[PDB]
Amino acid sequence: MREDMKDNVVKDKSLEFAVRIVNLYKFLVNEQKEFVMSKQILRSGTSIGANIREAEQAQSRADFINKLNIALKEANETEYWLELLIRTEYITREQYESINNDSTEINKLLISIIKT
Amino acid sequence: DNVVKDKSLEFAVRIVNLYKFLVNEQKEFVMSKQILRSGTSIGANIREAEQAQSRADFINKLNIALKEANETEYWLELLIRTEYITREQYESINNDSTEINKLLISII
Amino acid sequence: VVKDKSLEFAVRIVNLYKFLVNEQKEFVMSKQILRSGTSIGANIREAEQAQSRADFINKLNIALKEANETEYWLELLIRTEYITREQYESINNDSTEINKLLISIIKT
Amino acid sequence: MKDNVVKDKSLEFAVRIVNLYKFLVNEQKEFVMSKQILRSGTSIGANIREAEQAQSRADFINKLNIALKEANETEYWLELLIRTEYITREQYESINNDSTEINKLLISIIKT
Amino acid sequence: GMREDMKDNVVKDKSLEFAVRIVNLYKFLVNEQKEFVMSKQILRSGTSIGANIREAEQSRADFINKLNIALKEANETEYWLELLIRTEYITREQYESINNDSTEINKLLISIIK
Numbered sequence: 001m002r003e004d005m006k007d008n009v010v011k012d013k014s015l016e017f018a019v020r021i022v023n024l025y026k027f028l029v030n031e032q033k034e035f036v037m038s039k040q041i042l043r044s045g046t047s048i049g050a051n052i053r054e055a056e057q058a059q060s061r062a063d064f065i066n067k068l069n070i071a072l073k074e075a076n077e078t079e080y081w082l083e084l085l086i087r088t089e090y091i092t093r094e095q096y097e098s099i100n101n102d103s104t105e106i107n108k109l110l111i112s113i114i115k116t
Numbered sequence: 117d118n119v120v121k122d123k124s125l126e127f128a129v130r131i132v133n134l135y136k137f138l139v140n141e142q143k144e145f146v147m148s149k150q151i152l153r154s155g156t157s158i159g160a161n162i163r164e165a166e167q168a169q170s171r172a173d174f175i176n177k178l179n180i181a182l183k184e185a186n187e188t189e190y191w192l193e194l195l196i197r198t199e200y201i202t203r204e205q206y207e208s209i210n211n212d213s214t215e216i217n218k219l220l221i222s223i224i
Numbered sequence: 225v226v227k228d229k230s231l232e233f234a235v236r237i238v239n240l241y242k243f244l245v246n247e248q249k250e251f252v253m254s255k256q257i258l259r260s261g262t263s264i265g266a267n268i269r270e271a272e273q274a275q276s277r278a279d280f281i282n283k284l285n286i287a288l289k290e291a292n293e294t295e296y297w298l299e300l301l302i303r304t305e306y307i308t309r310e311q312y313e314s315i316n317n318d319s320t321e322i323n324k325l326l327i328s329i330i331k332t
Numbered sequence: 333m334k335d336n337v338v339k340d341k342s343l344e345f346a347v348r349i350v351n352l353y354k355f356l357v358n359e360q361k362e363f364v365m366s367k368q369i370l371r372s373g374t375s376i377g378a379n380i381r382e383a384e385q386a387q388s389r390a391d392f393i394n395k396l397n398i399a400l401k402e403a404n405e406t407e408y409w410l411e412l413l414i415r416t417e418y419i420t421r422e423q424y425e426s427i428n429n430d431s432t433e434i435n436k437l438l439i440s441i442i443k444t
Numbered sequence: 445g446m447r448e449d450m451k452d453n454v455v456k457d458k459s460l461e462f463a464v465r466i467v468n469l470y471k472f473l474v475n476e477q478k479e480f481v482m483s484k485q486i487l488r489s490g491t492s493i494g495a496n497i498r499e500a501e502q503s504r505a506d507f508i509n510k511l512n513i514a515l516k517e518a519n520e521t522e523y524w525l526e527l528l529i530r531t532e533y534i535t536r537e538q539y540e541s542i543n544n545d546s547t548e549i550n551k552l553l554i555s556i557i558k
């Protein structure tokens with residue numbers, strides 16, 4: 001993808017992802033009656049976009065990169081919770097692959113920006 | 117200082133009213149609770165700032181208020197993208213949030 | 225004196241929490257005030273066990289901070305009709321009594 | 333022997349606290365003070381365990397001080413529970429006796 | 445011992461596997477033993493360990509802080525295991541197996557931190 005766009009695209013992807021994470025939370029709580037892992041991943045999964053939003057408001061490029069690094073942290077924690085959820089049969093392989101692929105797409109873009 | 121005190125409490129009230137709409141009418145229970153916390157915590161941190169015993173503490177709490185404001189703005193973006201609120205609701209609340217941000221930044 | 229008042233106050237906050245959750249279906253501000261309101265007495269107890277005057281005063285200042293936070297939530301709760309004016313004034317009078325007694329210990 | 337004694341006593345007290353939690357939730361339908369004392373009451377032993385695994389003296393004393401804080405917090409919730417009549421005077425004295433026994437052991441060790 | 449530079453890689457892997465075991469212990473406790481208190485607590489502490497280890501992947505200070513949180517949660521988990529064996533909700537076999545896995549994580553974290 002065009003290098004200039006990477007930040008604008010990762011913002012939009014993170015908002016779409018937050019919405020998917022909200023839906024996953026509802027699924028886990030309402031259908032699977034799972035209250036512990038669900039709360040953890042609701043937080044980490046929606047915090048990716050929140051930190052990207054802080055990054056966009058940075059007063060320095062330093063602060064920008066740092067906020068993106070916190071977004072990356074949150075993406076990685078979310079990936080941990082997703083892996084735990086598939087291994088313990090709270091989500092199907094289809095659910096896992098779909099959501100995890102969106103997560104890892106965000107990882108890739110954040111790393112590019114950070115490393116760019 | 118008095119002004120952002122009043123405005124942040126008034127803003128907390130509006131967030132509660134938005135929360136009531138979301139739970140009672142839209143039957144939305146996840147994002148509503150998130151914005152309820154972040155949006156009412158802005159005034160909580162401002163009040164803590166008012167009572168601070170040092171300048172660093174004062175600025176530190178006002179910075180936390182600004183972080184809660186940005187979180188609140190984030191949840192509002194998600195609520196309009198997902199069509200749980202109207203553009204009118206979004207603009208009205210965001211106008212009030214912007215006013216508080218400007219005040220905090222001026223003070224900080 | 226303030227010790228006993230803070231324990232009685234913690235009981236009122238526990239019962240307010242139960243009212244907010246079970247009757248008003250409110251889970252977020254209720255959680256905040258449960259914490260702040262019961263933390264007052266917990267910190268006053270910690271104060272009594274402090275090994276220095278500085279640590280004694282620090283713990284009482286934290287209790288005072290928690291009292292102030294409590295009062296913010298109470299104000300928001302009456303403004304948003306989760307509690308009556310009568311409930312607010314009763315509970316707030318008790319909370320602010322604790323501010324006064326703490327300040328007298330710390331500063332006089 | 334205070335080290336081994338406070339370990340044993342804190343584990344027994346933790347079990348008492350789990351049983352108090354069950355009583356409060358199942359019989360008394362009390363979900364708020366119960367949750368708080370479950371945390372504090374079991375945190376005493378948890379912190380004693382961390383103290384035992386401490387790599388330094390500062391870490392050791394820190395963790396025992398946290399245990400003592402958690403013992404004092406447990407006694408605070410116990411006071412709230414007797415005040416609201418969720419436990420009897422006898423129940424209160426019995427559980428409080430065990431908590432204060434731990435307080436004294438912890439202080440003794442910290443002051444060594 | 446293993447190479448120092450592999451301890452972080454291994455503790456990451458082991459903590460995920462351990463979180464899986466803890467979830468399975470939770471399911472056993474609630475479904476088979478009808479135990480609802482310690483099970484919920486250990487679920488939280490035991491799954492949190494690997495989450496904090498993942499976070500440490502993203503300052504030396506902050507790195508050490510996160511790993512110390514993971515270590516605290518490992519110890520909390522090990523305390524709940526102690527309570528579970530003391531109260532006879534798990535066998536000595538289950539206790540030793542799960543505890544050994546948990547304490548292998550403690551050892552790796554301590555070494556990485558020091």
Ligand SMILES: [Ca+2]
Pocket residue numbers: 004005006007008
């Ligand atoms: Ca761009």
Ligand SMILES: [Ca+2]
Pocket residue numbers: 208211212
């Ligand atoms: Ca306006």
Ligand SMILES: [Ca+2]
Pocket residue numbers: 449450451452453
């Ligand atoms: Ca490595």
Ligand SMILES: [Cl-]
Pocket residue numbers: 026143144145146
């Ligand atoms: Cl919902």
Ligand SMILES: [Cl-]
Pocket residue numbers: 354478479480481
């Ligand atoms: Cl049970």
